[PDB]
Amino acid sequence: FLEIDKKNCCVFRDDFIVKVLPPVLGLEFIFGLLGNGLALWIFCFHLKSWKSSRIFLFNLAVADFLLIICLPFLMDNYVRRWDWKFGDIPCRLMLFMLAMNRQGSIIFLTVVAVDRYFRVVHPHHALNKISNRTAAIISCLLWGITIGLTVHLLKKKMPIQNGGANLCSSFSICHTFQWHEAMFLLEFFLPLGIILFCSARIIWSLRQRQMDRHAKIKRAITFIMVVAIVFVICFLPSVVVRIRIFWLLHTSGTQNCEVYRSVDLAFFITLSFTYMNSMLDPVVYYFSSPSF
Amino acid sequence: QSELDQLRQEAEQLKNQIRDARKACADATLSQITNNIDPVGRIQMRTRRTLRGHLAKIYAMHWGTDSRLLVSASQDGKLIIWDSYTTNKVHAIPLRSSWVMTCAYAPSGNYVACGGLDNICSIYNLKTREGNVRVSRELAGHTGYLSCCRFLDDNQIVTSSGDTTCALWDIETGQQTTTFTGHTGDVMSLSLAPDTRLFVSGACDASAKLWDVREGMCRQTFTGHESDINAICFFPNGNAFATGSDDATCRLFDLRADQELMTYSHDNIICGITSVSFSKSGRLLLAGYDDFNCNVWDALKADRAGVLAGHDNRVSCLGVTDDGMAVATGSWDSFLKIWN
Amino acid sequence: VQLVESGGGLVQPGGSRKLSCSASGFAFSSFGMHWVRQAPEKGLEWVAYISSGSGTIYYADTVKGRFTISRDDPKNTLFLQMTSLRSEDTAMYYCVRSIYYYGSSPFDFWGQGTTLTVSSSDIVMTQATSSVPVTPGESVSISCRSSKSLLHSNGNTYLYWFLQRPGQSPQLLIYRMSNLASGVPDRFSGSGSGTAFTLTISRLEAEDVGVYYCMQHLEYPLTFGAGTKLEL
Amino acid sequence: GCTLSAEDKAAVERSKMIDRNLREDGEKAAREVKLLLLGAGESGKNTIVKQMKITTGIVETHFTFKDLHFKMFDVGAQRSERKKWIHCFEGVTAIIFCVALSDYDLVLAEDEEMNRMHASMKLFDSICNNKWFTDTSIILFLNKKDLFEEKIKKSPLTICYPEYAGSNTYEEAAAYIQCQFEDLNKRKDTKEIYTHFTCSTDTKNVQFVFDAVTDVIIKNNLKDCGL
Amino acid sequence: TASIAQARKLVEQLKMEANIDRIKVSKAAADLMAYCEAHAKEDPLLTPVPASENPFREKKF
Ligand SMILES: O=C(O)c1cccnc1
């Protein structure tokens, strides 16, 4: 039913969430826990962040690690229908950690894809031979770019009550056009274009150099399309249902909300498909990686 | 050809006579004479300083006789004088040839040498009226790579080379006053005696030859190894020396007995020795290996006292200071570590 | 090796003057360069210092703010922009070569400075004597007293002995309390402990006479002693 | 920290200046491509360095092609054994290996029972299967190509290779020499052998060197990113 | 006659380094052992001196 934080945004405590979302979030939590635990443990003690690309991969690891350690808070929320039983500023920083680590994971996937693009199609570039003390500067500046776009949730009212149930979700169906939903669409579409352009150009260069016949290059040209399709099958089903939401906002307003219930149930299952990229990025970005 | 064959018969007679003479001198091994001696304990040396700044593999270091400055040569074309107590760099000498295989600090400290694949011992004046380090001489008479150079004085330097010869030089003249032409493999190491009248030179013919600097002769020859001798170091007495070879054994020879005294080998060691030094008393035999770590040998009981394990690549150079205070250990992982 | 200072002359007070030092014959970009005053018939006084690569700039608290020292390592040129020139700034401004590594001899080359004429905490180095008449051949012991222990914790004592012959720029004799400089003959020797210092000249000659300044290099500003003049 | 003296601080500052110059020199040398130029005694290395770049020791040949600085280290004047200095070129980008393929029938100057192409084969076997060049790619050059295509009209390849079953045309014998040199690779999955024939070409050998070095730099970029 | 000078000077070298007065290996080993005990206290590597006498320490900054 309807709710107005500052505008009218129909919210729903639908009963399919409590059935299916805590198991998939528990699986994503424990799988990403073992993956990012091994990954951050290796990147901190076994092999240090020796290269520029290892710094960018470590930043992807700490981004999706902060996401999966934020994740059991959202799981314990999903044991409830939408009641947040853990205060008001903890859920505000929980939504901040979710949105910021989801966008930071996307930004670090994109910078690893651009680093691989310059390592393949522009191999005599200065950006391939950059030191650690500028790779860490670039990574902390990208962290700043992400946090500066996601702190607008930090300045929010935290839990928004429904009728007694204390909801805390930063993806409310509001027609105001907040920076969070536009940042969702932008954080897909601009890194989709960059990751797809860089991956397609990497495959086209490693085929035009006739060097795909090597035993390890044809592994890499598969595991670059693998990270591209992992990005797509994890982030696209949330963005298409958010575009369905925007279509219903342009065609329907906020009058009848019972089709929004099904659309938002789909939206939150695909938001679990978002965090499974945070689960999958350890094995795909480091355990598929040689020299590891 | 009868004459060459009858004289090599005389040569084999001389080898048999020398072998049986030094076998008649062999009555009791050093490992059974020093069996009553209380062994040194578990040598635990920590990395006190680590010297960062070389970009490529460090091929040689040499301590200054002030026991604080050391030069290190790496194949990024840089000769770096380090201050060890403060870790900081005193000079960076860019080399005309990047392929440096040896470096030597002068005992005065005024000069430093380097050399390698350019077959030239460049000598660098550290103490100029200008603030730069300039080349004072380039010794260009060797036809193989320079594997070791060693300063006798400010003006004398003996250089090992891969053309199977050592050579005593005069720096103000620029020409070799003496050539030591006895080895049949590439000479890979030098060690001056402490009284600087003798030097030993190990070569790739598995033989160490003791030379006389003044007379220019091969005084003694020491064949105890199976593979190429990469490293040599005099005992602080000057009456013995140890050799590090690719046989993965260190052998200590004596000048007065003219034979091998010990064998510092371990059955868990298959890779050769790149570097050999002694402590200030000669009780400890610091030996660098290709298994990425130095090994500290009891030089009187052949029991491995300690292990200096801090290097990510092959230990290529090590020196103990003249006061025996520290062991610098440079390596192919582009760092020198100071141990104590 | 030549340090040729330029500029100076008569400057009416409150006006600026840029003192240039064209360096020649040495690797200028490697040397930390100093400016050292010498007021007429007075002692040496350190003015400014710029590091090798211009990364560290110190001034005397007399000139802190009014003076600026700068380099041109391509042109091998040291500058001293002297804004708001007071009447105590009339002196001969020597430019001093100095390099700092382990075992270096800083303050070892001084330029023949420019006489600049103007119209009208710190470690005090006390040389209690101020004029010692000696014949050639006598063993002199010029002393110097510090207001603070110049013996640092690392082991060396940052005391610098200079000889300003008349009509000559100062010349470093003893660097770090015991070490003779490069052109200095083995007749000067330094000794001392922390605060009390002495320079023992043995078998004095006719060119060894002149003014003798001790200088600390433990702490900035580098204060000189009032010089012990030697006559015949 | 104020535990240092006024001269200890300036010595530390001098060391940081030295560090800055060392880092800039290492970054300058990181852009440059190091090439270990090898080959037999009469293999045509000097023809290669005089048509690619347009006393004792080893000889470096700096040249610039398409905004890469290359450095070709000729080590032909080292009569000492390769075992004691070949690890100096561990970390070289590629190995230019020149083979005068017209010397299939010719024998050496120091030993006249071994022919020069089999000596070049044994040198290629020692260099390719070395422990230091397990991943260093080899840009192999078969140099004297037109002299080879004349000499096989005058003398067959069965003098060199007895197991050869082809005729005395150029393309058969040239592909046979190329495959018999590329069969000396015992890694075959870690290092790549790039092969060319360099008789009278105009700026094509250095283009082949740039392309093979670009493939090596792509593979080392991908290993620097773990891929 | 091609390398008779090399082989004959090899015979001369084997003749001159045969005619050296060797010392028995017991006296050589005992002189090395006497040098090792006569200088054992002047060895900062087998006797690790405490940090006030060692110039190589750990730094606060
Ligand atoms: O983690 C998120 O992105 C999230 C999930 C539910 C509600 N708001 C944000």
Coordinates of C-alpha atoms in Angstrom, one line a residue, chain B residues 53 55 57 59 75 78 80 88-92 99 101 117-119 131 142-145 162 186 188 204 228 230 246 314 332, chain D residues 8 11-12 14-15 18-19 21-23 25-26 56-58 60 73 77-81 83-85 87-90 131-132:
Chain B
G53 CA 66.3 1.5 -4.2
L55 CA 65.3 -1.7 -9.5
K57 CA 68.9 -7.8 -9.6
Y59 CA 74.9 -8.6 -8.6
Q75 CA 71.9 -4.4 -13.4
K78 CA 73.3 1.8 -10.9
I80 CA 74.7 2.8 -5.1
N88 CA 70.0 6.2 3.3
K89 CA 71.8 6.5 0.0
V90 CA 75.1 8.3 -0.2
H91 CA 75.7 8.1 -4.0
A92 CA 73.9 6.7 -7.0
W99 CA 75.6 -5.2 -17.2
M101 CA 78.7 -8.2 -12.4
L117 CA 79.9 -7.8 -19.5
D118 CA 81.6 -4.7 -21.0
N119 CA 85.0 -6.3 -20.0
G131 CA 79.8 16.8 -6.1
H142 CA 90.2 -8.1 -20.3
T143 CA 88.5 -10.0 -23.2
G144 CA 85.9 -11.7 -21.0
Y145 CA 83.4 -10.3 -18.6
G162 CA 85.8 -14.7 -17.7
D186 CA 86.2 -18.6 -16.4
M188 CA 84.4 -16.2 -11.2
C204 CA 84.8 -22.6 -13.6
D228 CA 82.1 -24.2 -11.1
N230 CA 81.3 -19.1 -8.0
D246 CA 77.7 -24.8 -8.1
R314 CA 68.6 -15.8 -5.3
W332 CA 68.2 -10.8 -7.2
Chain D
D8 CA 71.3 13.8 9.0
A11 CA 71.5 13.5 4.1
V12 CA 68.1 11.9 4.2
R14 CA 69.8 13.9 -0.5
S15 CA 68.9 10.2 -0.3
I18 CA 68.6 10.0 -5.1
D19 CA 65.5 7.9 -4.7
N21 CA 66.3 10.0 -9.7
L22 CA 66.4 6.2 -9.3
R23 CA 62.7 5.8 -9.7
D25 CA 65.6 6.0 -14.2
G26 CA 63.8 2.8 -13.5
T56 CA 85.6 -5.8 -26.4
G57 CA 82.6 -6.3 -24.2
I58 CA 78.9 -6.6 -25.3
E60 CA 74.0 -2.5 -27.1
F73 CA 72.4 -6.5 -26.7
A77 CA 82.1 -11.1 -28.4
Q78 CA 81.9 -13.2 -25.2
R79 CA 84.1 -16.2 -25.8
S80 CA 83.5 -17.2 -22.1
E81 CA 80.8 -19.8 -21.4
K83 CA 76.3 -20.3 -18.1
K84 CA 77.9 -17.6 -16.0
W85 CA 76.4 -14.5 -17.6
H87 CA 71.2 -15.0 -16.3
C88 CA 72.0 -11.3 -16.7
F89 CA 69.5 -11.3 -19.6
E90 CA 66.8 -13.1 -17.5
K131 CA 66.1 -22.1 -17.3
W132 CA 66.3 -18.3 -17.6

